[PDB]
């Protein structure tokens, strides 16, 4: 068997992100799984999480500066956010307060 | 968001033509139809706390839900759920105005499905007081704005599931 | 409207071959070190 | 179902195979089994 | 992918209901231009390779910075007959894939198999995606010159490649 | 849906559709307000053909409503006549799709998982849709009543 | 058809600098095909001869 | 957009919208069928609009053109037209939308950034916005001239 | 993975010691629970399907999930539900046997909160039929192995939140 | 943020060892550069406008970039990216200065090949206009100086890649 | 994955230009150089074996690394450390032969930090390897060699920190 | 946050009850114990500075966490550490006089094992140090209170395994 | 031989013979009428270099010709030098193949197996290869003891 690379064959625009990163020495160090987040991301709405990277957001803690998606972790989500686009924040006390 | 109107600008800006016929023809099937989307949303703000109330006594007023033990039982939780019944009615209508349901991915179902999975709100009542409340908005703006807002309705639906 | 992105990688076709990349391309994908015998042809052309 | 200009595959560095037909001398042997290592393993670990 | 029966056979089974008469009178404005909508599969079938060399001409005599060479930013354009093959090659998966649709009824096909993952890859090899909209355009203009005596059929047309273009185009408004 | 199964078994072979599937969805929009009239009969005689089917189904399988068995009692009794109304509803869905797509996805796939893990005889269920299948072929004519039978059928062998 | 001359003899003093004349095979195969509807074949034979 | 602009402020106080912004709306789309002729007689002068008014802003401000000007040249003043094209577009999309939501949004926002990095004097490009308002009100009579005037002003005044 | 063995031979071995006193203690408490742990997880794999079924039943069976429009309405989804709770039961039996909880940290919990969020899998009411599942569980093996159990069955709760 | 004098510091701080023969070269090395480049850095801060605005004019110019349906099309589009190579070059000059690319990691590259992913930026395209910036730099502050100056211009194409 | 002579073909190749004086100056270089580029990539392949060794004893052998606790401390850890010296010395000739740094970017700069600080190596000390390795290589293909072969050395470090 | 007689009254509420004789026992068992939680808060925050430096002395004093290279070596480091236990220890007081952890949860437990595992802390050695205070505290405040206050001491090294 | 390894490329590639591929043959066999030259000279002092060059072993390491070693005795140091003549033939072997793989398939593979079940210092058995490079390289010219010295140092590697 060979990897059945990008100039070996005609590809789909559909795992186009996600195979290329699959043949690449780094594969391994992903200990979480790329393909049924993404495949079945492709059907649900927009992610609860930061217009930016998913590396973005930080711990809600009571001090911190603690941002664990780096190249440590390796758990980057990109997804594509509109420039007016709106967070549903939750209120911290009564919810009928927001 | 956009509506209708920006949607035509947006597609032909992406080309750099300035107009053609062809897209003259979509602007003109919305101004068709724009008296139509007009007295269909006064109706339905001035009719929003009744169309409500008419939905939530049909749907979920004296089940599980509202006993003890179930979501909507303190009062600060029953006044949260007419609140997010009044969200959906609201976007709805901008919707229908804009004719485009671009306005309910960006800011209503954005994230909004993982937000009631963090605070155990039922997913599937839910969906049962949006289609309780398609029929009854359906019969105060009629079954031509009906149709049509309805068709935003179940977009809440098909994004909430 | 789509709402998930696998990424996009900095990603450069194949254009076309020439006499020194495929005799040392042909070494990488073997780990070989570059055998004597494909020296010795690299050397050649570049003597031209 | 996907379609490509067969020139465009031509272009480039051409990946090459490896068989296994009994009566090759040991060093192609060797190749076609080392191949195979890097590739189920991603890397030859019979020689790390 | 899900066809117009399938759509609405699903937005019903989240509720847990039957088919009453407004999701029948869903099915029947398919099973009304379904006999229409296979004569419009079947010009583009006949017409196919056709169709393609008009919106390539047409898109080049408009956009002649495409057959030129790319600049020193690594443009993916139709520069040379290796680019040029691979990029007729697009212009028949959107008209491949916008004759499935047509039939469909839906634009459930056109997302799942074109649109998820599309950007990412014309951003991954630099292929504009400004022409890419137009030549998507020039397709609909084309089709529907065949079709000028009943207009009903221009609106079943314009539905699989109008969708191609608000969905792979920016948000500038 | 049979329109879907032609556009995803001519995208695998990587080209259009060809004349053998162009007539074969001709054939189905011909026949469309055909099936919206019987799938719209089994839809307004949903409680005599749920309680019909129950009711021979009770006889078949006494077992099941004795003391000990998975639907004794009003309130379990009740709960087998809801699942036969499932797959009454199922069943009007795979006519109207002509195909039984919306069947296999909703209901068939893991159907010996579920009822395995609830208690429930999965013979019986299928002794049950057997028992529709007879009060649901009595609304309809001779040849309407053979239509119908395939998707009848097809959830009986994949309830075995 | 001037522009083409150029690329014919710009492109083959990329062959021979570079190594091999894959570059030119590449865009050269199907070429004939793709135009010989626009313009005659025999009369390109006879320019690059 | 004018629904657009009346749904945001709507949504920025969280209520319906008042049926004063309903009324704005009503009006808006009865009146189509003029500014859908109002832009068309602009699409049809692209040339005596940009090429008029942009010969009029040459020997206005000569020293773009001479040397050392930043259009100083042919292929720079090419460029210089690119942009008095540009605008003269987006002035349709205003004139059909009711808004000058397409005119910020499209080359509004951070104009005089993108003129700084390029080195031409804002102060010239406002000039030559003016001299193409007297060839676009030429062509309308009084009643429609005020209408395209009112998206002009918009853009000479946030130009500076 | 590493049992509670071989936890205690990398921590000396880290530092190039041999095994002191401190660390001996550590393998004599495994050895002395060695036969309690192999008597409970018997028991456990001949009840697993009753351990499962009581436990949805208890949490989750009469619920909004079970209905249409709520997650694991279909048969499919009620299927693939109780397959995983057949995996949390097992890979926590493997966690009691060796001690330690290594082994749902690698083939359990990495990237398991990723995984739901983008099925849409509600994590509430799936810590729910863990912990209806830890009852069930204690009943069966007892109060002193019963109480091991629910040591493995909170790493998987709380390592889910 | 950290230069290259204390990141020698630190190296043999958390070893406990004072700075031997060794770490003293390192630190010689930077001592017989470190006119240089303030003089390189001096020149930079004068030419920090025109050095933008001619390595976009010789890489994406006049490109199909400009043209409508491609990126940084619209003003704000153009704005947004001049704004990002003053970040390029401002913090390129940073690191050389400091003679340790620390303070691009952190502030620079840390996070950015994720929020061009989720924006739509195109990479390839934007490496080579930080090419083109690399060779213009190279004019002004000469081949000496410019070498090192080009050695943190690739650090953001390595990271950014 | 290029050579001298695809960068300077593609430099004009895609402004439509022949190649002019200035242009082939760069092949000239490379061309002219290739009898002694073929000459180190001769020996260095003898001597492989040989430089790793005299690299790691020079570098990191007696260190805390080499102890328990560190990082390279096992037998497996030690194979996998000089198994990636074999790496670096490889390409670093691939680099010196084809003239040209883009094949370490592709498949050797590519994730290599990714995978360092996910798997805890210290990059730091890596450096320090790839360093002495420099100057072992130095000695046996000469000084000219040794020149043209540590800036691909030099290229692997600053992109390894 | 919700103590003893909180977690009682809302249990009764979410089965819309009356306090019964089961309720009132879990009442009168706080209102009993509750003055000798009330003495154990005292002693331990007249200890408090020296119940923390005798589990550091304990535990984690004269190994190599504190000599150069171990992870709280300079001054700094050291200071958070022991700010750490502070905070352990003052929460550990609070959840023993609401006699219910739910105070842990909230601000404590929430995202600590992936604040540690981002910075490089141990969590086996700060598991260590509390077991290390849970001894030195059940001197002070006896073998009621001391059983009591390990209740809590083992729920945070719990959540921070 | 080059020749074959050549082809073995190529064929796995599934195409003809490359321009450059082939430029290799023809200056390979060019340089026929060198090679036999260069292995010619080796082969006349094959005594002056196994004979020179294992005594020089024997002071380099007297302990495997001492009591308890490999080599002790008059039949284990005539087996130790029957060795140095087949290695000595190997080298040749190479110099006129153009290539290491006669020397690797014949005397390369699996050679710490054989030497580990004989007892054998492989670090014993590489010093004497070390020994016999330098009397072979003494007897030819500079221009030629760099290109056999490589055969040399190519089994040095892979004998350790
Ligand atoms: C603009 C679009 C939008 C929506 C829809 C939205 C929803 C939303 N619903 C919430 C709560 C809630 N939502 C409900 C809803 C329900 N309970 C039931 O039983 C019913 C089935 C259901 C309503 C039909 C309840 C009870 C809460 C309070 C949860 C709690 O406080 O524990 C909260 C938390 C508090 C806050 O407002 O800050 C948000 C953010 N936010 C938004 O920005
Ligand atoms: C624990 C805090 C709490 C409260 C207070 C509460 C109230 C509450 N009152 C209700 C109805 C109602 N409440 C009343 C009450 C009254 N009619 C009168 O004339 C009097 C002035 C008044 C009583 C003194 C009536 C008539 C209904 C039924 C009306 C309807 O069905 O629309 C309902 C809907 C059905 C139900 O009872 O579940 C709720 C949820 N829920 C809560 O969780
Ligand atoms: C079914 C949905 C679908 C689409 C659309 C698709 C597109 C697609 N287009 C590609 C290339 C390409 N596409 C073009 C296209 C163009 N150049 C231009 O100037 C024009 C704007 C445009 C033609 C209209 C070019 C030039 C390349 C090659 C780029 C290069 O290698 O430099 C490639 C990489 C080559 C390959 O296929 O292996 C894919 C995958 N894949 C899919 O699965
Ligand atoms: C260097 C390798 C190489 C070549 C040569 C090449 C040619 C090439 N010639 C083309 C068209 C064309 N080529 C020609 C003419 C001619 N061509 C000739 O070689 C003759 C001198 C002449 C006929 C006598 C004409 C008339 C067209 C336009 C055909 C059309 O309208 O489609 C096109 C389509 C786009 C365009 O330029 O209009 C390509 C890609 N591509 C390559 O990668
Ligand atoms: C749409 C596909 C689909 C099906 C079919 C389905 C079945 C289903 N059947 C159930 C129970 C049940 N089902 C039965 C059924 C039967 N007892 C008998 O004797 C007969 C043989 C048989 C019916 C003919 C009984 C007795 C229960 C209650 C079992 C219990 O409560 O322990 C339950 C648990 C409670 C509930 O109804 O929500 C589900 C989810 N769910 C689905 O989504
Ligand atoms: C949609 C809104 C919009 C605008 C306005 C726009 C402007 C714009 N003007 C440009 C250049 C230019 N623009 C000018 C303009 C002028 N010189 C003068 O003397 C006059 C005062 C002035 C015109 C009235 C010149 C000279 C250049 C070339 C600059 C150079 O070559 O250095 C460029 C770079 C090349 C290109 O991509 O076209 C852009 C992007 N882009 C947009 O998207
Ligand atoms: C071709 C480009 C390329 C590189 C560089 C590469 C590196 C790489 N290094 C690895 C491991 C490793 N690398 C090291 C390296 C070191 N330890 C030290 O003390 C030193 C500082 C340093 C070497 C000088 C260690 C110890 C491991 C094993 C780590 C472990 O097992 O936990 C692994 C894991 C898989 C395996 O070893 O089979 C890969 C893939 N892969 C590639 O494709
Ligand atoms: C209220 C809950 C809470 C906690 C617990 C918390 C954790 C916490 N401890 C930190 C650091 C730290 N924490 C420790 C503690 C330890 N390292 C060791 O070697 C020992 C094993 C262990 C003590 C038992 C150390 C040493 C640091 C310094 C890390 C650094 O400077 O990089 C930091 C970084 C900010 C700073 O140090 O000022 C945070 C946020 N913050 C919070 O809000």
Redesign the pocket.
């Known amino acids: 068997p060979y990897i059945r690379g990008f100039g070996e064959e005609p590809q789909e625009c559909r795992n186009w992100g996600t195979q290329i990163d699959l043949f690449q020495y780094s594969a391994p160090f992903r200990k979480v799984p790329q393909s049924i987040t993404l495949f079945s991301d492709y059907l649900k709405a927009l992610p609860d999480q930061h217009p930016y990277g998913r590396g973005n957001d930080p711990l809600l803690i009571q001090f911190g500066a603690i941002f664990p998606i780096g190249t440590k972790n390796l758990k980057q989500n990109p997804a594509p956010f509109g420039k007016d686009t709106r967070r549903l924040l939750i209120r911290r006390g009564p919810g009928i307060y927001n | 968001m956009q509506d209708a109107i920006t949607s035509v600008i947006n597609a032909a800006d992406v080309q750099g033509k300035y107009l053609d016929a062809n897209s003259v023809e979509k602007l003109r099937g919305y101004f068709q139809t724009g008296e139509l989307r007009v007295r269909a949303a006064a109706t339905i703000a001035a009719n929003a706390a009744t169309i409500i109330k008419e939905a939530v006594?049909k749907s979920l007023?004296?089940s599980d839900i509202?006993?003890?033990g179930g979501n909507?039982?303190?009062?600060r939780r029953?006044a949260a759920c007419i609140r997010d019944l009044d969200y959906y009615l609201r976007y709805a209508t901008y919707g229908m105005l804009a004719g485009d349901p671009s306005i309910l991915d960006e800011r209503v179902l954005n994230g909004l499905k993982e937000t009631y999975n963090s605070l155990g709100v039922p997913i599937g009542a839910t969906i049962q007081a949006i289609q309780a409340m398609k029929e009854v908005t359906g019969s105060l703006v009629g079954s031509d704005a009906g149709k049509e807002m309805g068709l935003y309705f179940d977009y809440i639906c098909s994004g909430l599931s | 409207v789509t709402k998930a992105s696998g990424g996009s990688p900095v990603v450069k076709p194949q254009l076309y071959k020439t006499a020194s990349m495929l005799t040392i391309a042909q070494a990488e994908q073997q780990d070989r070190f570059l055998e004597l015998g494909e020296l010795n042809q690299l050397v050649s052309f570049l003597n031209t | 179902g996907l379609r490509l200009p067969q020139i465009y595959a031509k272009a480039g560095i051409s990946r090459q195979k490896f068989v296994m037909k009994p009566g090759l001398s040991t060093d192609e042997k060797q190749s076609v089994i080392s191949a195979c290592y890097r590739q189920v393993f991603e890397r030859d670990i019979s020689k790390a | 992918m899900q066809d117009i029966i399938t759509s609405v056979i699903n937005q019903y089974d989240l509720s847990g209901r039957y088919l009453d008469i407004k999701g029948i009178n869903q099915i029947n404005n398919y099973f009304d231009t379904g006999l229409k909508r296979l004569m419009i599969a079947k010009l583009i079938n006949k017409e196919a390779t056709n169709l393609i060399k008009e919106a390539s001409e047409l898109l080049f005599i408009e956009q002649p910075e495409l057959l030129r060479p790319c600049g020193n930013a690594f443009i993916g354009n139709a520069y040379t007959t290796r680019r040029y093959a691979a990029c007729i090659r697009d212009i028949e998966y959107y008209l491949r894939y916008s004759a499935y649709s047509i039939i469909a009824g839906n634009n459930s096909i056109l997302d799942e198999r074109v649109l998820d993952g599309l950007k990412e890859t014309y951003n991954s090899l630099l292929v504009p995606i400004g022409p890419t909209i137009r030549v998507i355009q020039l397709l609909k203009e084309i089709i529907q010159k065949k079709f000028s005596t009943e207009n009903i059929e221009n609106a079943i047309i314009a539905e699989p490649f109008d969708y191609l273009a608000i969905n792979l185009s920016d948000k500038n408004l | 849906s049979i329109v879907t199964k032609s556009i995803v078994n001519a995208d695998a072979e990587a080209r259009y559709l060809s004349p053998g599937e162009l007539d074969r969805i001709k054939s189905f929009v011909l026949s469309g307000q055909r099936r919206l009239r019987i799938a719209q009969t089994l839809t307004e005689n949903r409680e005599r053909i749920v309680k019909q089917g129950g009711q021979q189904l009770f006889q078949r399988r006494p077992d099941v409503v004795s003391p000990g068995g998975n639907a004794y009692g009003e309130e379990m009794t009740a709960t087998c006549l809801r699942d036969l109304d499932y797959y009454l509803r199922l069943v009007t869905y795979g006519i109207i799709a002509g195909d039984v797509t919306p069947i296999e996805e909703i209901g068939l796939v893991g159907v010996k998982e579920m009822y395995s893990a609830l208690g429930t005889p999965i013979s019986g269920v299928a002794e049950g849709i057997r028992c529709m299948k007879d009060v649901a072929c009595s609304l309809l004519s001779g040849e309407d009543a053979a239509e119908v039978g395939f998707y009848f059928d097809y959830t009986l062998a994949a309830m075995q | 058809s001037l522009r083409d001359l150029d690329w014919f003899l710009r492109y083959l003093t990329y062959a021979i600098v570079a190594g091999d004349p894959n570059i030119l095979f590449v865009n050269i195969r199907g070429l004939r095909e793709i135009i010989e509807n626009a313009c005659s074949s025999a009369a390109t034979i006879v320019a690059l001869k």
Request: glycine letters at 0%; aromatic letters at 28%; zero cysteines.
């Open positions: 006594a007023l004296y509202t006993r003890p909507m039982y303190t009062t029953y």
